[PDB]
Symmetry: C3
Subunit: 336 residues, 3 copies
């Protein structure tokens, strides 16, 4: 691909939307290779992550935890303008697991407060991939402070099953999973700090126990439940992209399955099928395709149930439609 | 299928056997779709999990930990009669990962002590699946108190390898692995309680450490050893179903291998081959097929060896037959 | 084959080399089946695992942690002469996950100090496999004290991808990952012991937390960095064999990918492709094949980033060559 050919490719700016929702995109590529442009402003800010007012000084791409899902197609280029406002206190950068070279982009995007940078990379491999901050010397701290997200590089011709049959989803959601390590005082109460740096020592100590105090979806316990449950209808095909930048997770749709699951998150690797519970290793993203068949409220969780129900890794799906008694029926209701 | 068509299907009452054994069944479907009937009584009882007399208040389906393995074929209907004796003190239900709708059946099977219920679901996906109690707000507690098992939904035409060659086993064993979280007093001694509800607060604190005090097969340290070691003979084909409803595991047959391993536990996903150690995520069941080629004692373990030899995750296999010197021989026995 | 036929086979004595290097071998087997001979002397020795000077009484095959990588081809016989010098104090043996029978050879190789033994086994299955000490009663202690390594059984026709295309690497490295559990005093300082036995009780207590104090490559924090960093060049094809005999790991090449990854380590199981982060469960070895495309420094880590950067699981690659601006380019360097 000559130098002229690359400079001639069309440039297209895209407006990002906050997770679990995903920005406008087409499953099958529209036109030839493009340079897809995105801009994200980094925000350091205190967020409350549970019903007890527990705080964390989050480091958030685009102001959200997880950062937004960026979608492009194989062989498109992703051109990110990353802005670090002077109001922030730390140097930040970004590592796209989808990219090749300079530590995923980290070595070329180190920006101090008051600086911005523009990185471009060719998305040569199809699949969902994690992206995260990675300042040399404090990589895990930045990541476990919520500075991570994922992108999806769709095959130019959309998704397909193991047999080559097309798999077109009606809706897509991005569930970013986050392990937080919040310090506690001797009485067991979560501590609060004035500035991000103040919590550093105490936090690394908790991190070393390899035991998170919270494991959440969309940045807080219950963020994807109640009135914020994701939605679908019977017959609707849904793609659920799930990521975990630092620690293993095992997604499970309670009352459902993963009809096709690219557990490694890479589309050239044939998807597993009829999954009850899939596995995504820390530092990766995966994707599950399911066609809902029963209406009702479903729970979507990390299937180490303590992490799901004691630590916060549980989301909900509200599904409309008609019940199918062939698939399931209460022959005899609960009775003495 | 219409309600009328289902009602016209033949019914077959199966009698369950305690793990690791599996009730009589046929690998290849004997005739068209039928309604396979099972009955299980919930028993809240005390179990001793180690040689130090450590106790756990178990919540056991059919009186055992794990609950028994139920076997049907794809597209059969599994009709479960679940009974919660008045002697029990808690509400219980059942979520079948193999089922579709109402949280796996959990939403339609909540039964208080003194009640019973009958659930019927269609086994549309082939493979081994976990089933476990899941009372709202009490989910992980019940599961880690031993209330879980698995079922196997065989393909109508039995098992096959990745190329369609049939795989027929001579024996089948079901190993249910359980992570227990037993509270300790200020002297490191495990605590005992006179009531299930009495140990709740103490147990949740331990559960939050995400560090089990015990990891066992069939409910206790050494359960599947000695009088309970599994058996086989050189030349015999054996399928080992293994589940873990709450935490990851990595099975390994010491001295052998997993010739064919459906690691995700789903039969429409080709099995991995020539496996040394496979992986099953918390919340799932998997299955390995192996043809013994050497006689002698074998150990079967969760290969985090601390979990296997310090925490209790180890079982034994006694194999009869002639030793094969081509495969292995001691050229020079241990000597000066 | 009969004893006579085995005795007639040619024999080749191989000289082992220290990890991450691998002894000379041919990817495509040259000639028919051979009895490949190896010799390893077990050394119980004190090793320093971090910059602070933390000590561990290692139990090391060939004097290194991990033990060296032995390479044979499918259906060759691996004949190991194992020596336990009289200067040692413990009985040792070896379990080859690649072998069939007697606990992987463990039951035939128990040698006391001052003894030796010669074990021979047929390498019937292709792939990388863990080997580790396993004296009944102290199995995990030996392994987490560093007594483990791996072997590679190459297909006689060399490596191929999932579709029959040959995969020939230019160089190979073996990364053995070790989880250590070092006791600490009341000041949180690592403790030193005069003899290995002295540390047993304290170490077992740490092991039970299932939380290693160190997670390292090639025996120590930073062991594969600086002048010991691995090397490659743009266009070079590298195979990275990775093992972990006791605990899970999720390898990731920062700045690159795993073009083909036999995550399970078994060559007859098609490899995953375009991987960002793969997963190797405790008790197994895996291998990733990658063709470098960008020059510069890369980090190779266990992608639970706390384990990589706080606990020690990080290695570096120095790659020579021309930068590819098509794959990645800084449109705008960090600036105001
Ligand atoms: Cu940052
Ligand atoms: Cu990363
Ligand atoms: Cu229950
Ligand atoms: Cu479940
Ligand atoms: Cu040893
Ligand atoms: Cu082993």
């Amino acid at each position: 691909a000559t130098a002229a050919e690359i400079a001639a490719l069309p440039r297209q700016k895209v407006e990002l939307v906050d997770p679990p929702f995903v920005h406008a995109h087409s499953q099958v590529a529209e036109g030839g290779p493009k340079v897809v442009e995105f801009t994200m402003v980094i925000e350091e800010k205190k967020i409350v992550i549970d019903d007890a007012g527990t705080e964390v000084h989050a480091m958030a791409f685009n102001g959200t935890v997880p950062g937004p899902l960026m979608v492009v197609h194989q062989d498109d280029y992703l051109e990110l303008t990353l802005i670090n406002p002077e109001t922030n206190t730390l140097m930040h950068n970004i590592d796209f697991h989808a990219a090749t070279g300079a530590l995923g982009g980290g070595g070329l995007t180190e920006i101090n407060p008051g600086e911005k940078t523009i990185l471009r990379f060719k998305a040569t491999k199809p699949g969902v991939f994690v992206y995260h901050c990675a300042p040399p010397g404090m990589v895990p701290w930045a990541v476990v402070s919520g500075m991570n997200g994922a992108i999806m590089v769709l095959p130019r011709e959309g998704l397909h099953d193991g047999k080559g049959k097309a798999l077109t989803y009606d809706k897509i959601y991005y569930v970013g999973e986050q392990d937080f390590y919040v310090p506690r005082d001797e009485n067991g109460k979560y501590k609060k700090y004035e500035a991000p740096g103040d919590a550093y020592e105490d936090t690394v100590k908790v991190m070393r126990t390899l035991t998170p105090t919270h494991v959440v979806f969309n940045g807080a316990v219950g963020a994807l439940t109640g009135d914020k449950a994701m939605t679908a209808a019977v017959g609707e095909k849904v793609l659920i992209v799930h990521s975990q930048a630092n620690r293993d997770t095992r997604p499970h749709l309670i009352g459902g399955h993963g009809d096709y699951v690219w557990a490694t998150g890479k589309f050239n690797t044939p998807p597993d099928v009829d999954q009850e519970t899939w596995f995504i290793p820390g530092g990766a993203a995966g994707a599950a395709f399911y066609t809902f068949q029963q209406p009702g409220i479903y729970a979507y969780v990390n299937h180490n149930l303590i992490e799901a129900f004691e630590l916060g890794a549980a989301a909900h799906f509200k599904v409309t439609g008609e019940w199918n008694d062939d698939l399931m029926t209460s022959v005899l209701a609960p009775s003495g």
